[PDB]
Every structure is written in structure tokens, then in C-alpha cells.
Amino acid sequence: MTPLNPTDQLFLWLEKRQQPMHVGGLQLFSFPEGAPDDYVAQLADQLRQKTEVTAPFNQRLSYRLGQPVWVEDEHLDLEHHFRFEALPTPGRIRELLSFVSAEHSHLMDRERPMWEVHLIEGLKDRQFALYTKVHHSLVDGVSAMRMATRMLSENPDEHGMPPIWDLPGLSGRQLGTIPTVAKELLKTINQARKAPRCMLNQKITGSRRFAAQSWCLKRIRAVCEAYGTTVNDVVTAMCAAALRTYLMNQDALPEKPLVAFVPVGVILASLHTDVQEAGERLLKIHHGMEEAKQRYRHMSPEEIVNYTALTLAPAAFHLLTGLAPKWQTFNVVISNVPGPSRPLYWNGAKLEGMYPVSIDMDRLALNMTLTSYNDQVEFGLIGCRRTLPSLQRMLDYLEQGLAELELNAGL
Amino acid sequence: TPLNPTDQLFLWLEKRQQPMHVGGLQLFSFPEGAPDDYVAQLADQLRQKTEVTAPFNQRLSYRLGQPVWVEDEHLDLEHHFRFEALPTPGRIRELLSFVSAEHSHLMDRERPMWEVHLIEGLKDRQFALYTKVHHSLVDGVSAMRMATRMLSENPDEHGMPPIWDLPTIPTVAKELLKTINQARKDPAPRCMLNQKITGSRRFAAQSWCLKRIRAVCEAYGTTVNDVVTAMCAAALRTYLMNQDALPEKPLVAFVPVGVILASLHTDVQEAGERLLKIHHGMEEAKQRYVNYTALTLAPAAFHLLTGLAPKWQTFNVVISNVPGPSRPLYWNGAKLEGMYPVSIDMDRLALNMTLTSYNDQVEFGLIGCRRTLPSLQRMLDYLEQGLAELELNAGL
Ligand SMILES: [Cl-]
Ligand SMILES: [Cl-]
Ligand SMILES: [Cl-]
Ligand SMILES: [Cl-]
Ligand SMILES: [Cl-]
Ligand SMILES: [Cl-]
């Protein structure tokens, strides 16, 4: 049936036990007003009933002799894909994040459609959670977190809404062994005529630590006006500050500043983690990204795509092989994919916060992913638990980075 | 320390479809007069017992090419020890679903391949311990022995530590063929159990009283192991029939004793007939009894490994029966109510039946591929039904 376009084949290919290639999202809701004490157990019961499943959630991987294809899954077992779980006492945010860190570590089964929805009960003050896991071969990261929003509605009076499973690389080619495709990368790089070493950039384990948090938008806009910067600048500065504090605290802050892979096009933006004052760092970040985007002003899509693909080929060789440290090119991904501008509800349950859960790799231990929802900006930090001890502390380091800017300007 | 060669095999057999870790489901009761926050209190005290004795502090490394254990320096006890809870209504059914999910997840080779999951939210003042350890680090009999050796017969003993702290395929398959051809000089039906599997698991467990089983023994003049086997035979027969997939010929069980291949007589229609032919079969079969055994199984290893030899399947299911403690056991005052093994499925061995005994009861642990064995939990009913048919037929 439907074949596997070459980018989907790639996420299957570089998947291994230490780098699962699934994305995820963590949605936090409040009990709908006037809900029985046992509202989540009631909810799980009727979701188990809902057995109709539509594309892409009924697709499953199969091979036609040698080539991977999707196929319509005749016998899908909804109690494999849908799960009702509970947090251990005391059921607060620290426990919710431990649950997602454990669950996000686990490889998905390739013999079934590669999605899971986890309904979590046991949260303290009349909240519940949805943790959704989908393989990148089946759904990329943004349309995943668009489906999770499209699954909701603006009207809190409305009920009977469905669940998510029932809804209305340029010069690459083939499967190969790693030396084979790595050598095609050298050839590509060499006939193209011819970022510091960091603790974030080493081989990783398959265990994850997830840290998420919300920050109020107008709090951040206040910092924008004071410094004459954009929202994107401040949030990138919050990441630069947090990363700086974290690596100092580990005595592992490099002398050269960190560099971030930043979609906007693709910017290789310096984070300036060698700068000490916060206002200085924000503005060097602001102009540094302003100027890096302008190198795209006089370029057509064909150009950007080719410039993008040629610039990153050495980084791809290093990620795949670990044999070219000087080619690391960026120390972390900081992704920002904007979300819905107004409050949302699932059958009268208010979405209180939506947090993406992204992919770590060998030599990218940390992936910072960002989104916005109405009042707030949402930070999702996913990291290898071994190479990044105490990763949850980066939430306080982000918050301290924003408060330092606020003090410096007296807001 | 380098891995002994059988430890190397379990790392080599492992794939996403067949993780090679074993597990144990221990069921406990609250110690007498313990508070309602007992497990949360227990959880927080186990986070502190931070010293880890071998093998639980070993981790896999390689010297140039060959695999070796090394002591793990930086052990993260928050990774290996987890504290988790059952969703509503906290039944044993929720508990078996929790184990089914955890047991499907590959272990991380970058850390000591063990895990202990303390489970709260059981309905009536009980907690559970789901322990998972990789076979290449600790095999199934040592895991269960260690798991009971962690307990004591004294309900007043306290300060008792947790388990972690106490005193290529073508090439190999072609070598299998050569070993078969230089051994065949010697002067099991197709079945739904025996297809390729997924890595998703379903675990079903249940206890039965040994007095109930002994009554059936005396009535028919069979042993305990015969009747326990007849329960398995009866259970498999019902399950396959309801699936419209009971083959003509009888299933054969691989049964460790040495190793005997016992007909389960799943074509026989009557409970007593099936019980007795199983009893005479296993009698005869061991009345014939490391070289005959490990050579008569090389063809089965070939099919399991390659799927290229279906008439060599040799057995449809493993039924292992390890004995266990005679007297009631305790952990810092918490009474062990039950101890259930969680074994390993493989390609063309979608179901594994592992048995143990504790105090007055025999424990059945069924672990199967969730897709190959839809509604695996019905087996526990068909097990019970197998014993009732025997009771009913003898008028007990
Ligand atoms: Cl896993
Ligand atoms: Cl995965
Ligand atoms: Cl899956
Ligand atoms: Cl973890
Ligand atoms: Cl592990
Ligand atoms: Cl499963």
C-alpha cells in the first residue's frame, strides 16, 4: 500500500535503544466544573469503548520484499494503545514528570501502529493528564502537536468530543549500513569543494529525564519592551541563561559559547554562554539572530534547502559516527512551534498546559522544545538521564534567567 | 569479569520482539497495624538504602570485543528503584496489566540490568513488588531464589534489606546444522503458539490451593505434578478451541526435570482420560532416562532461531516447574501472599508457562505475546476449569 517517503525511512533507520525516535506530548487538564471525585476513572471507561480508529493511527509498518510500506491494520487492540495509569503518592508535578520520563524512554513496538495515549489519574487538586507518544516515522513533531490541539475545542459547554485516534533530507536515498551512508556523506562533503566540545554532546543512554514548565507571556513581553527585543529573543535568552547556569553548576561550562540549532529556515545562533550579564547576553543573542536570519533575505526556497543541506552535512556525519568532533556545529536544538491563541477544553476539561516531548540522540543529549498556549509559553526539556544529572533544575535556571533580566531593568 | 558463554547467548538472542529479561511479581500484605501511608513511607525509606551488592552493581562492558561485567561506579538508584501506583479500582486485573506493560520494555544495557517497582494503590491493604532482571545477569532460578532469600519466616524480623543489597545468525544456524548432521547418526504440531511474535506482552497469574490439588491426586492416583500439568493441558485445549485453532495432533510441552517432551493429550476429550494419559506419558518418558538432551534439542534450536524448519518445532510450549518455600514468609513484617514468575517469550514460543509453589499454594505465571495470544487472561479461568472438571468427574 502507501510507501514510506524517504524522511520517514530515516527515523526508522537511526533508531536504536539509546535514541528512540518517537515524539510525545504532555497535556494537563482540570476536572470539568462539577465533576464527580472519580471523574478520571469514569473517563477511562468510555475511552476504552471508543473503538473506531482513523488514519494515520490505523497504519502499521510492513515490508514489500525489501521496501517499507504502511498498511491498514486489520486487528488493532485498543487496550494496547490506550492506557489508564495513576501517579504514586503524592501525585504532584514532580511525580507527573517522572511518569513521562519513564514512559518516553521506552521503544515502541514496530509491529503495531506506533502510537500510545496514556491517561494519568492520581493528580492532586482535581487535574488529570494525557501523555501521547507517536513515532516520528508515522507523524512528525508539529502535526502531532497540531492534532493534539485540533482534538480540542474553544467551547467549554460542548461535550462528546472524540479522542486523538479518531479525528475528522535532500541528498539521501536508501537503507544502508552506517559506514556506507557515512561515506556518501564524506563524498558529498568533499565535493562541496572540501561549536565547542560540551557535556551535552556525548554518547547517551536510553533513559530520559523530562522537565516542563509554563511562563506567563505578558511577563515576558514586559521584558521585550524594556529591552526593545522580541518574544523569541527573550525565550532564547532564557535557554542561554539556563544552559549557562547548568553547565557552570556542573563545572562543565565551555570557554567558547554554546551554539543552538534554531528553526525559524535554520539558524545556527550563538547562545553566548560566555557572557555574564543578562542584558548583554540577551542583546548579543538578539542581534546575532537578527543578522543570521538576514543571510536568508536574498534566497529562494531552492536556495535555502540547498544551503541548509550543505551546511549541515558535516554535522550529520558527526552525529552518525562520533568521528568528527570539530564538525559538531551545534550543541543543542531549541525548537519553537507556536500554538493556539485562546483557551481550550476537552469535553469541558480545560487544557491548563501543553508541553512537547522531543527526541534526544547520541551527541545531542538535550533537546529543548517550546510552544505557546494562550497566556503562556511552554518549555519542554527532554534529556538523557545519565549524561544530564538533575536536569529538572534547569526549570529554576530558566526562571532565574528571566528574573535576572527583570531585576536589571527594574520591572 | 567476562560473561560466561550462556550469559552471552541471552544478549545475542535479544531483539525488540523478544527481550531476554525475567521478572517476579511478589504480592505482600501490610504489616500488622501499619498506617495507610505505609507504602509511600516504605517507598521513601527504600530510596535511602543506597548501597548495592553484586550482581546488582555489575554492568556490561566490552574489552576490545568480548563482553565483560564491571562494577558500576555511579549507580542511579532513582533509575533502578521506582515507586508507582495502580489506577482505579486497584484490582489484581490492574496489577496484571501493569506487569504486562513493564515486562514488554527492553532494559538499558548502559546500566545494571535490574529494576524493582514498588506498587501502591492495591485495593485492600496490600502492596506489590515487580522485579525485573536481565537473564544474562541473573537467571530465572537465581532470581526467584534471591527473591525469597530476601524474606524471612520471622514476622518480627525488621531492618531487612531490599533485593539489591544483601550478602551472526546465518553463521550460528549453519553451525547448528553441522552439529545436527554429525549427531543424527543415532542408532509437535503446527500451532498458533508457534509464530513470530511482537514485543508487547500479556501476563496472567493466579494461585490454587495444594489441598484442592492433593484431593484430586488421591482420587486418580496421580502426582501433584501430573495434575498441575493436566490443568495446563486442559487450559491450552480450551483456549485453542475457543480460537478455533486446536490442531489434530496433541500439543507437546517442553518440561524441565534434564528435559522431557511430554504430550499434553489436547486431542483427548475427557478430563480423567487426559489426566491419566499425561501421567503414564511422563512416567514412561522419564523411565527412559547432558549429551542426549543437548543433542536432541539442536533441531528445535534451529527452527526457533531461523523459522526454516517447522517440522523441527519439537515442542509447542514450555512448562517449567521450580519449587519454592514451604512456610509463610515475611518482609519487615509484610506477609508474602504470593510470588509469580514472569518468564520469556520468543519467536515461535509465544507462550511460556512457569510454575512455582509457596506455602500452601501452587503459583501459575503465564507470559505471552499480546497479539498472538488475544485474551490470554482467559487461561486462568480455563486452568481453574481444568481442575473443576477433574473434581466434578470424581464427585468432590
Ligand atoms: Cl524500554
Ligand atoms: Cl520508539
Ligand atoms: Cl506501540
Ligand atoms: Cl529513566
Ligand atoms: Cl533498566
Ligand atoms: Cl503491551
Instruction: Characterize the bridge pairing of strands A127-135 and A208-216.
Output: unpaired
Cα radius of gyration rounded to whole Å, chain B: 22
User: Into which CATH architecture does domain A195-338+359-409 fall?
Assistant: 2-Layer Sandwich (3.30)
Q: Alpha-carbon distance A73 to A1, whole Å?
A: 12
Q: Which residues contact B230 (CB under 8 A, 6 or more apart)?
A: B222, B271, B274, B275, B278, B386, B390
| DSSP 8-state symbol, B22 | E
- Whether residue A122 and residue B87 make contact (CB cut-off 8 A), yes or no, is yes
Entry field: residues in chain A: 411
A350/B226 Cα distance (integer angstroms)? 59
Instruction: Say if the Cβ atoms of A205 and B37 lie within 8 Å.
Output: no
- The residue whose grid cell reads 468530543 is A161
Q: Do A77 and B198 touch (CB under 8 A)?
A: no
Q: Which of residues 62-81 of B touch A (CB under 8 A)?
A: 76, 79
In whole angstroms, what is the distance from residue A5 CA to residue A136 CA? 12
The residue extents of the domains of chain A are 195-338+359-409
User: What is the pairing mode between strands B252-256 and B259-263?
Assistant: antiparallel
Q: In this structure, which topology does domain B5-167 adopt according to CATH?
A: Chloramphenicol Acetyltransferase (3.30.559)
Q: How far is the CA of B74 from the centre of ligand 5 (A)?
A: 14
Contacts of A141-149 spanning 24+ positions with Cβ under 8 A = A141/A23, A141/A335, A141/A337, A141/A356, A141/A358, A141/A369, A142/A337, A144/A23, A144/A25, A145/A25, A145/A337, A145/A339, A145/A354, A145/A356, A145/A371, A148/A25, A148/A27, A148/A354, A149/A339, A149/A340, A149/A344, A149/A354
Report angle CA B181, B186, B190 to the nearest 5 degrees. 70
Do residue B79 and residue A207 have CB atoms under 8 angstroms apart? yes
| H or E, element range at A261 | strand A259-263
- Kind and range of the H or E element at B256? strand B252-256
- Whether B190 contacts chain A with CB within 8 A: no
Which residues from A are below 8 Å from B84, CB to CB? 88
Residue B147 in contact with residue B28, Cβ under 8 Å? no
Residues of B labelled as active-site residues: 135
Size of interface A-B (CB pairs under 8 A): 84
d(CA A186, CA A315): 11
Give chain B positions within 8 Å (CB) of A122: 85, 87, 121
A302-310, Cβ contacts within 8 angstroms, sequence gap of 24 or more: A304/A265, A305/A170, A306/A170, A308/A265, A308/A266, A309/A169, A309/A170, A309/A171, A310/A192
The CA-based angle B56-B60-B66, given to 5 degrees, is 140
Phi, psi of B259 (to 5 degrees): -145, 125
Asked whether the bond before A56 is cis by omega within 30 degrees of 0, the reply is yes
Residue A262, strand partner residues? A267
Between CA A314 and CA A307 the distance in angstroms is: 13
On whether the CB atoms of residues B83 and B65 are closer than 8 A, the answer is no
Query: Which residues in B lie closer than 8 A to residue A18 (C-beta atoms)?
Result: 108, 110
Enumerate residues 6+ apart whose C-beta is below 8 A from B243. Answer: B192, B374
Instruction: Collect all residues of chain A within an 8 Å Cβ-Cβ radius of residue B110.
Output: 18, 205-207, 386
Pair A112, B17: CB distance under 8 Å: no
Nearest CA in chain A to B103: A106
Shortest Cα distance from B210 to chain A (angstroms)? 34
**What is the C-alpha to C-alpha distance for residues B350 and B325, in angstroms, rounded to an integer?**
29
- Dist CA B113 CA B107 (whole Å): 6
Three cell numbers, residue B395: 464427585
Nearest Cα of chain A lies from the Cα of B212 at a distance, in angstroms, of 35
CB atoms within 10 A of CB B263: 19
Tell me, yes or no, if A318 is annotated catalytic: no
Axis crossing angle, helix B271-287 with helix B224-242, rounded to the nearest 10: 120
Give me the long-range contacts of B356-360 (CB less than 8 A, separation at least 24): B356/B144, B356/B321, B356/B322, B356/B323, B356/B324, B357/B210, B357/B323, B357/B324, B358/B324, B358/B325, B358/B329, B359/B325, B359/B326, B359/B327, B359/B328, B359/B329, B360/B209, B360/B210, B360/B211
Closest CA to A341 of A375, A374, A372: A374
Grid cell, residue B194, equals 508457534
- Alpha helices for chain B (secondary structure H): 5-13, 38-46, 77-80, 92-102, 140-149, 169-181, 210-220, 224-242, 271-287, 293-296, 298-306, 378-394
Residues in chain B: 396
Looking only at the bridges linking them, the beta strands covering B81-85 and B114-120 are: parallel
DSSP A79: H
Per DSSP bridges, beta strands A259-263 and A332-336 are: parallel
Experimental method reported for this structure: X-ray
Q: How many helices (H) and strands (E) does chain A have?
A: 11, 14
Buried b (16+ CB within 10 A) or exposed e, B213-222: bebbbebbeb
| Cell numbers standing for residue B58 | 555489575
Q: Which residue of B has its CA nearest to A116?
A: B101
The verdict on B42 touching A (C-beta cutoff 8 Å) is: no
Whether A77 and B43 lie within 8 Å, measured CB to CB: no
Q: Which grid coordinates belong to A121?
A: 489519574
The terminus-to-terminus CA distance of chain A in angstroms comes to 59
A169 touches chain B (CB under 8 A): no
DSSP of B343-360, one letter per residue?
A: ---BTTB-EEEEEEEETT
How do beta strands B361-369 and B114-120 pair? Answer: unpaired
Q: How far is the CA of B203 from the centre of ligand 6 (A)?
A: 9
Choose the closest CB to B200 out of A41, A80, A90: A80
Q: A106 touching B, CB under 8 A? A: yes
Collapsed DSSP state (helix, strand, coil) of residue A286: helix
Q: Is B328 exposed, middle or buried (0-12, 13-18, 19+ CB in 10 A)?
A: middle
Using the Cβ of B44 and the Cβ atoms of chain A, whether some distance falls under 8 Å is answered with no
How far, in whole angstroms, is CA B46 from its chain's centroid? 26
| Dist CA A45 CA A33 (whole Å) | 19
Query: Pick from B322, B387, B334, B348: which is nearest to B144 by CA?
Result: B322
Give B84 to chain A, closest Cα distance, Å: 5
Q: Classify residue B292 by its DSSP letter.
A: S
What's the grid cell of residue B172?
550460528
Report DSSP letters for A192-257, one per residue. Answer: TT-----TTSS---S-EEEEEEEEEHHHHHHHHHHHT--HHHHHHHHHHHHHHHHHHHTT---SSP
Cell 486442559: give the residue: B234
Which grid cell sits at B300? 528445535
Of B39, B40, B110, which has the smallest distance from its Cβ to A386's Cβ? B110
**d(Cα A96, Cα A120) in Å, to the nearest integer?**
8
How far is Cα A151 from Cα A158, in angstroms, rounded to an integer?
Answer: 13
Q: Which residues contact A357 (CB under 8 A, 6 or more apart)?
A: A23, A24, A25, A26, A100, A104, A131, A133, A210, A369, A380, A382
CATH number of B176-326+343-394: 3.30.559.30
- Identify all chain B residues contacting A89, using CB atoms and an 8 Å cutoff: 37, 39-40, 43, 85, 120
Which chain A residue has the Cα nearest residue B375?
A77
Q: Which of B291, B359, B293, B289 is nearest to B329 (CA)?
A: B359
Resolution to 1 decimal place, in Å: 2.4
Q: How many helices (H) and strands (E) does chain B have?
A: 12, 14
A386: three-class secondary structure by DSSP: coil
Contact B132, B114 (CB under 8 A): yes
- Whether chain A has a CB inside 8 Å of the CB on B12: the answer is no
Retrieve residue B270's grid coordinates.
Answer: 475427557
Torsion sign over Cα A222, A227, A229, A234: negative
Determine which of B84, B102, B106, B192 to mutate to test the interface with A (most A C-beta atoms within 10 Å). B84
Please judge whether A84 and B87 are an interchain contact, meaning their C-beta atoms are less than 8 angstroms apart.
yes
**Nearest residue of chain B to residue A205 (CA atoms):** B110
DSSP B57-79: TEEEEEETTEEEEEE-SS--HHH
- Which candidate from A89, A112, A207 shows the least CB-CB separation from B40? A89
Chain B residue at shortest CA distance from A122? B87
Can you tell me the distance from the alpha carbon of A289 to that of A267, in angstroms, rounded to the nearest whole number?
Answer: 7
Same fold, B5-167 and B176-326+343-394: yes
Contacts of B389 (CB under 8 A, 6+ apart): B234, B271
A111 touching B, CB under 8 A?
A: yes
Cis status, amide bond into B55, omega within 30 of 0: yes
On whether the CB atoms of residues A319 and A361 are closer than 8 A, the answer is yes
